[PDB]
Amino acid sequence: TASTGFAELLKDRREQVKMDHAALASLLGETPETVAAWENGEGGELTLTQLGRIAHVLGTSIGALTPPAGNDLDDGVIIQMPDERPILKGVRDNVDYYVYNCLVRTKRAPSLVPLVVDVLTDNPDDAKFNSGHAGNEFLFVLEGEIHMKWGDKENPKEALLPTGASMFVEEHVPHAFTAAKGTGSAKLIAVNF
Amino acid sequence: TASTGFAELLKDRREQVKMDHAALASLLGETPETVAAWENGEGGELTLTQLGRIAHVLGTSIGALTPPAGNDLDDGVIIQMPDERPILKGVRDNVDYYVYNCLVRTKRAPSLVPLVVDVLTDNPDDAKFNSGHAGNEFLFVLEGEIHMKWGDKENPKEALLPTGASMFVEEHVPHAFTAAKGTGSAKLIAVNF
Amino acid sequence: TASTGFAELLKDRREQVKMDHAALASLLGETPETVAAWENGEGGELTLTQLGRIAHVLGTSIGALTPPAGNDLDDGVIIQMPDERPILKGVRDNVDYYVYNCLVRTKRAPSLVPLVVDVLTDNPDDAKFNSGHAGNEFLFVLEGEIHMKWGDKENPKEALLPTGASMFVEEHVPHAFTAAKGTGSAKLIAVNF
Amino acid sequence: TASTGFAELLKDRREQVKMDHAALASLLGETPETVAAWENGEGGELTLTQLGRIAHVLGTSIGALTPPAGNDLDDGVIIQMPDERPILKGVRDNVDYYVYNCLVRTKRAPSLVPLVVDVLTDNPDDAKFNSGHAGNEFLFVLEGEIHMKWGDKENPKEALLPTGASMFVEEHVPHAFTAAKGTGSAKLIAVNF
Ligand SMILES: C[C@H](O)CP(=O)(O)O
Ligand SMILES: C[C@H](O)CP(=O)(O)O
Ligand SMILES: C[C@H](O)CP(=O)(O)O
């Protein structure tokens, strides 16, 4: 219930900064009746920009006025069966680099992005980097032998990791993988949290 | 930029969750082309409810997809002049209870809500109990004697604060004020944070 | 440098709450010279209880006065080779239940505890529970077929998960596993974050 | 309890990281028996440095192993009477610059540091610039006219605040005060949070 959430959250914030329907409606160029309406979940039709302005007026953020992602835990758990896991071909300049067998996700923890990654190429030098991403990542070499390279794309550090190897990659640090030269392909689990 | 922020964030999350315009538009029932537009700034007219399903599909929250409150500081600062304060006369049980002189606030501190409160009632017995509120609040008796009350509405704790008294009230703790009986009126600084 | 950290942090906090060496030394029953000394890293010999009292006086916590766990990232990464991963037999009432092949850890993120867990028993009913633990957990069925059971130890929910299954277990929720009846043994990856 | 807390936390972490007294005592070079004692409350005499290696072995921080600041509230509250404030006369360049009348503080809000500051100097030109400080600070001109300055020490921003002015200074922003030139003295409420 986006509207319901907004309705409860708007009300709170308004009172929080000591404003009555009238005070607020003014700053927004709206009628007190309207504001009062919104506090009823009748705001569902508001646009992103308006919500943007309402936040500004209330000196806070759209996030602060919208509700939590929600809960989807089955008494505290979510299960994803193997066959029903999303696949996503990944091409770096039309070069099939990875394949993403997306694992179980949850609104109770969106920062969590589990992945079984299929390393397609095995050309260490034809390895394409990523600028690094937000949140840390946990890696476990599933199959084959991954040839990891992190740091500066111009001259990065590196280590070929045998199956069984586990690695941590701090947030925002650039990295790239491929199999050991000539080995063909490899597999690893990638956990972004 | 309420959209611009949304644009780079939708992009961020889309990639984070290993998806493409093509795949995302699908779960939403939109044009693969349409998403692309959103990711380019054309999201401005998206309704609240509409934002709700999107953040859901990306198993995240609208907050996570909208930008932070802007930065409204003048080189990390902001002033408010005395004749510039918003005034809100409070009413509990149809009684000229308080008067809220709203002090400086910053988008960089949504939770900071500084107030000068003029306590108009001087009859403790007639005091009205808010239900408590979120966020801790620091108080300072500006003038007069503040007759305070906190805890349970029926059998509450009492405290007589002389001018200069300073107090802290934890978040969620219910409370009420008045000027000590007969003293007429009191004043105090109330900082919610 | 525990002492160095404390030395810098104590200094900050002291000034923060407006106290001079003398003011502080008093409340602690120490000499100003001593306090001044500590601010030099000469506090290394302080005991847990004393640090406990110093914190109290400064109205803060030992944590707030001690330094961050430190950094061990090799330019942003840590690698653990398969053979060098800690093993830990786990017996529930002398019943070899699990085996813990601990993966790469890091001071930059202690909440992260990666584990390859060897499910030894395969008696669903002889399954022993855990009261649930702090932080969420990500699970991936490595080998065999795990027989998961979560919730109330008296009557929990359950699902036998085929290899490839991935599950999320919210913090503090009780859980237990074993292989599918008769299958012998199973393996899964456990990520606590 | 500075130990009691440490005891249950060491226990917590030990288990969290999949270890036993036997294994932990090893990396520390202690008696498997010794750890057990720690886990039972006998940790009181552990030196700071000693705490440093322990938290290290458990790849975590001393903070994570020590308990939170206690709770010092009277049913979620605490008062401070005017003749009860700690007084600290400030000195910058050997000048009776400020005077700090320390208001109420709570262990439940380590960062809340409320102050009544008596500004003794009235020569802007003689003002001394702190280097900025952590945590945002809300100010209120109690009496007089506060001649303010913020930004760079050489070419700073100036602002003349009349009694009643309210201002916010972001964390890390350098600044200085005095009473407007010739006015003799000013007073203001400074709330660090
Ligand atoms: C394995 C890699 O970490 C996956 P990427 O972040 O490059 O998408
Ligand atoms: C003074 C009071 O603390 C302000 P209220 O909480 O009633 O809004
Ligand atoms: C697999 C389980 O999650 C490991 P436990 O938390 O019971 O130690």
Ligand SMILES: C[C@H](O)CP(=O)(O)O
């Ligand atoms: C008033 C000032 O803001 C207090 P200082 O930062 O100098 O400690």
Ligand SMILES: [Fe+2]
């Ligand atoms: Fe990655």
Ligand SMILES: [Fe+2]
């Ligand atoms: Fe209040």
Ligand SMILES: [Fe+2]
């Ligand atoms: Fe677990």
Ligand SMILES: [Fe+2]
């Ligand atoms: Fe300051």
